[PDB]
Amino acid sequence: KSYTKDELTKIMDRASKIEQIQKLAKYAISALNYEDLPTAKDELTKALDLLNSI
Amino acid sequence: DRASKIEQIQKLAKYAISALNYEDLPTAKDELTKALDLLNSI
Amino acid sequence: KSYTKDELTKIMDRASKIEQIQKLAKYAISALNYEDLPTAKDELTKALDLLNSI
Amino acid sequence: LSSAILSEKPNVKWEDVAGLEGAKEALKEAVILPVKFPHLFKGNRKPTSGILLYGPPGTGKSYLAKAVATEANSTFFSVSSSDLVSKWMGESEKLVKQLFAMARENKPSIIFIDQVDALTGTRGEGESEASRRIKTELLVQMNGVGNDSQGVLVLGATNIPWQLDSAIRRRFERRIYIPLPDLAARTTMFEINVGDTPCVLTKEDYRTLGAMTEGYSGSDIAVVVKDALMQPIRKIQSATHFKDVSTEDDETRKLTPCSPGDDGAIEMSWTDIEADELKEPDLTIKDFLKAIKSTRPTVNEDDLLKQEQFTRDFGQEGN
Amino acid sequence: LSSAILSEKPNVKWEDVAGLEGAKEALKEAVILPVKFPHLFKGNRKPTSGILLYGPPGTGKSYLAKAVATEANSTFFSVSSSDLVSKWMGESEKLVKQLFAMARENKPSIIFIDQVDALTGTRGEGESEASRRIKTELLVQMNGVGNDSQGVLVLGATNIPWQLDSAIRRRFERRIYIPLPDLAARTTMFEINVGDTPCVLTKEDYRTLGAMTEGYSGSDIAVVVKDALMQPIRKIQSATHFKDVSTEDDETRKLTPCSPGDDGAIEMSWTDIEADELKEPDLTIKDFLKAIKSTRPTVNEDDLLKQEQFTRDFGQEGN
Numbered sequence: 001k002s003y004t005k006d007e008l009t010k011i012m013d014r015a016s017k018i019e020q021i022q023k024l025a026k027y028a029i030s031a032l033n034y035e036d037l038p039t040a041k042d043e044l045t046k047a048l049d050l051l052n053s054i
Numbered sequence: 055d056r057a058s059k060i061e062q063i064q065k066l067a068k069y070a071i072s073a074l075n076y077e078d079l080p081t082a083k084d085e086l087t088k089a090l091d092l093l094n095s096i
Numbered sequence: 097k098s099y100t101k102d103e104l105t106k107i108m109d110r111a112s113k114i115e116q117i118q119k120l121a122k123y124a125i126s127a128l129n130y131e132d133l134p135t136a137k138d139e140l141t142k143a144l145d146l147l148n149s150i
Numbered sequence: 151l152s153s154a155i156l157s158e159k160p161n162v163k164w165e166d167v168a169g170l171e172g173a174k175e176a177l178k179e180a181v182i183l184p185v186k187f188p189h190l191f192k193g194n195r196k197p198t199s200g201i202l203l204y205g206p207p208g209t210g211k212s213y214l215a216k217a218v219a220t221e222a223n224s225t226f227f228s229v230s231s232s233d234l235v236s237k238w239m240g241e242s243e244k245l246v247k248q249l250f251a252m253a254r255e256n257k258p259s260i261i262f263i264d265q266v267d268a269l270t271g272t273r274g275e276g277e278s279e280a281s282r283r284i285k286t287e288l289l290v291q292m293n294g295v296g297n298d299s300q301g302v303l304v305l306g307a308t309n310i311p312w313q314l315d316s317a318i319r320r321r322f323e324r325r326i327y328i329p330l331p332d333l334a335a336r337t338t339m340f341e342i343n344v345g346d347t348p349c350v351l352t353k354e355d356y357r358t359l360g361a362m363t364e365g366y367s368g369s370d371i372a373v374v375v376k377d378a379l380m381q382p383i384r385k386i387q388s389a390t391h392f393k394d395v396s397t398e399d400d401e402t403r404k405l406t407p408c409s410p411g412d413d414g415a416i417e418m419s420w421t422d423i424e425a426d427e428l429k430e431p432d433l434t435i436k437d438f439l440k441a442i443k444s445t446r447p448t449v450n451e452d453d454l455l456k457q458e459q460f461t462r463d464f465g466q467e468g469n
Numbered sequence: 470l471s472s473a474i475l476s477e478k479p480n481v482k483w484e485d486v487a488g489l490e491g492a493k494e495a496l497k498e499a500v501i502l503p504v505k506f507p508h509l510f511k512g513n514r515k516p517t518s519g520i521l522l523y524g525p526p527g528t529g530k531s532y533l534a535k536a537v538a539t540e541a542n543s544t545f546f547s548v549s550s551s552d553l554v555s556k557w558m559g560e561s562e563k564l565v566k567q568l569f570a571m572a573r574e575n576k577p578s579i580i581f582i583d584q585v586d587a588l589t590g591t592r593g594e595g596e597s598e599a600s601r602r603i604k605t606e607l608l609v610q611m612n613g614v615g616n617d618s619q620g621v622l623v624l625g626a627t628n629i630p631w632q633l634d635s636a637i638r639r640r641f642e643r644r645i646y647i648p649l650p651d652l653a654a655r656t657t658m659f660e661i662n663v664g665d666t667p668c669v670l671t672k673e674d675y676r677t678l679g680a681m682t683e684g685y686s687g688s689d690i691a692v693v694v695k696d697a698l699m700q701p702i703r704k705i706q707s708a709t710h711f712k713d714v715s716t717e718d719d720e721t722r723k724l725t726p727c728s729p730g731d732d733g734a735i736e737m738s739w740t741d742i743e744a745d746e747l748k749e750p751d752l753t754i755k756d757f758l759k760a761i762k763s764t765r766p767t768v769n770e771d772d773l774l775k776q777e778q779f780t781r782d783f784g785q786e787g788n
């Protein structure tokens with residue numbers, strides 16, 4: 001199925017990045033729940049940068 | 055001015071997360087961008 | 097307020113100096129309890145000179 | 151004067167144990183063949199009985215014990231050496247004799263002792279004198295089991311064979327190494343773990359994830375599987391937008407969580423959706439990829455080395 | 470015979486725990502969600518049985534245990550590893566078995582064992598006899614009911630994961646690493662520890678602090694907070710001179726300690742002033758600066774090396 005070892009490892013790598021972005025988003029959400037604007041901004045920005053790189 | 059906008063930001067973030075969970079990258083991008091712009095507008 | 101950042105360390109430094117002065121004063125008090133004028137007056141001199149440098 | 155020590159009906163078939171067919175064969179010869187055709191053991195081919203399962207933890211030794219117990223239809227007695235060590239201040243070993251008596255009364259029978267190494271050695275504070283006589287008792291019972299006609303089987307289990315008292319080893323018969331599962335055994339175990347769950351495409355994946363898990367145990371597989379299973383549940387937990395799957399031919403409209411970019415995407419919480427009308431996401435390879443991600447290599451190689459050593463030194467010769 | 474462990478708990482909420490919402494999710498999904506919707510776990514998807522909490526001390530593992538205990542609202546049992554060992558040298562297992570029975574009695578139960586490494590390893594004396602047999606019994610119990618039908622969750626705690634017996638390791642599910650708190654978490658802890666005292670300028674100060682605080686624990690943070698909270702008391706104790714705060718809206722006079730040059734600076738002792746009519750100084754950032762200065766980092770770097778080794782080897786792990 002289009003290289004079941006190598007391409008799938010790349011896919012997994014991308015998923016790990018995506019997972020990290022999700023985690024960042026969660027962090028941002030928690031920060032906002034405590035009205036911690038600059039930290040939320042940071043976390044969102046870092047997520048979006050990785051999105052833009054992807 | 056500051057409460058419902060935060061709620062909306064949170065909602066957008068949630069949407070983005072859902073999108074990412076289903077590998078919908080452009081939706082994620084647009085939702086995070088809207089969240090960020092809205093955050094800047096506060 | 098605009099809120100400084102690098103001045104916090106300097107504020108901490110000034111507090112350290114003030115702390116030192118307070119320590120000197122305490123030692124002077126201690127030395128005056130047993131009527132050791134020379135000790136107390138050297139310590140007070142030190143405190144005053146450094147506060148004049150502050 | 152009974153004092154009942156665990157007996158029960160597990161429901162683990164031969165086929166639920168994936169791999170180790172050589173041992174399985176050996177065990178069918180160790181238990182079932184003797185019972186079916188006893189007259190085959192006249193002469194210098196002998197009813198072997200004391201059998202050790204040894205190797206790393208997590209490899210279904212206990213699971214195998216359940217399987218033969220399900221399969222052999224012979225009374226399976228299952229015990230820790232910890233159990234019934236003493237009451238006093240005086241009297242032990244009577245319970246041991248009673249256990250041996252009851253097993254002789256319940257032929258064909260099987261004693262399973264997990265972690266046989268728990269009884270070993272020459273230390274003080276009890277082991278020099280008090281548990282020495284327990285040890286001795288054991289040794290004399292297992293001496294007498296080989297005497298006359300046997301219907302009792304002893305199965306040993308240990309992770310640390312090198313900590314197993316030698317005197318036992320000298321009295322004891324057949325030893326079988328239980329290795330970590332190989333490519334095939336891993337693959338099959340995956341397929342076993344799927345069962346009713348939507349199976350995605352072909353065997354290629356099962357073989358791939360088989361290959362990609364190297365050195366992991368049955369347990370290590372199972373946890374990963376459970377994680378993957380929980381992944382669609384996670385996908386439901388994080389939910390705004392859902393969408394209908396099933397057409398009007400079915401009993402009712404059936405809804406699954408989706409991205410905001412979807413067409414016909416209705417937004418609510420998972421809690422808002424009724425249980426039947428909810429459509430769980432299918433199991434994709436990515437769920438398993440993440441399940442791999444949640445399991446870092448589980449292998450302490452020193453243990454493997456030690457098992458190799460033991461394997462080379464004891465087990466080849468009868469002892 | 471029973472040896473009573475209490476299960477009624479205080480009110481520590483999820484929101485009192487800063488960070489690792491994924492571990493929180495795992496707790497909820499292992500406990501609350503199963504109880505909520507049991508039909509989720511029909512067929513081949515089955516609830517978690519074991520979770521190890523590990524890392525440096527002071528990180529709210531115990532705090533987390535209290536939080537889960539608050540939130541789960543089911544029989545939460547919690548025990549020291551030392552607790553319930555023996556009396557007459559070898560009578561140990563009765564209480565163990567009875568305890569596992571007690572877990573069975575009130576499903577869905579939760580067992581928390583603190584410092585699981587205290588009942589672990591191998592050398593002799595205890596790991597020849599008593600701690601041996603006890604470890605063994607533990608092992609038999611933990612997977613005994615765990616696989617197939619279960620109503621217990623086992624939570625372990627350890628600061629020294631690398632000393633955890635391999636066998637126990639393979640018997641146990643889900644490792645969760647507790648890293649030291651990050652900027653956000655520390656900030657949140659500061660906000661939690663605001664109290665009634667007027668919070669000088671905004672939360673920006675807490676963000677600053679959170680940034681300033683590097684490598685510290687929950688405990689450390691709490692202590693520094695306490696330290697800062699004593700500073701106004703200290704100031705009060707130091708002053709002779711106090712001054713009236715009370716505007717015309719107040720009923721009686723209200724006095725705060727001040728410098729000798731102050732307008733209305735009266736110089737009696739703090740002991741002479743009544744509790745209501747005394748006005749403690751508010752908390753400024755300088756008190757927190759002082760607090761920081763006083764309490765040096767508590768954490769040696771050399772533990773984190775072994776913790777990080779474990780993290781690379783096992784880490785965010787199923788097992």
Ligand SMILES: Nc1ncnc2c1ncn2[C@@H]1O[C@H](COP(=O)(O)OP(=O)(O)OP(=O)(O)O)[C@@H](O)[C@H]1O
Pocket residue numbers: 166167168206207208209210211212213214264307308309339367368369372612616636640
């Ligand atoms: N076919 C299989 N092979 C190996 N393990 C399996 C299999 N099916 C399920 N398992 C898993 O193996 C575990 C059963 O215990 P197991 O027999 O592996 O312990 P053990 O190898 O006897 O270890 P120890 O000697 O330390 O008790 C369960 O956690 C179960 O999920």
Ligand SMILES: Nc1ncnc2c1ncn2[C@@H]1O[C@H](COP(=O)(O)OP(=O)(O)OP(=O)(O)O)[C@@H](O)[C@H]1O
Pocket residue numbers: 485486487525526527528529530531532533626628658686687688689691692
């Ligand atoms: N939100 C929080 N996060 C982490 N720790 C907290 C939090 N709130 C309070 N604490 C602190 O947690 C401590 C309780 O012990 P704690 O649970 O940290 O120990 P532990 O993490 O179990 O590890 P060990 O037992 O090895 O110290 C208290 O000193 C308390 O100040």
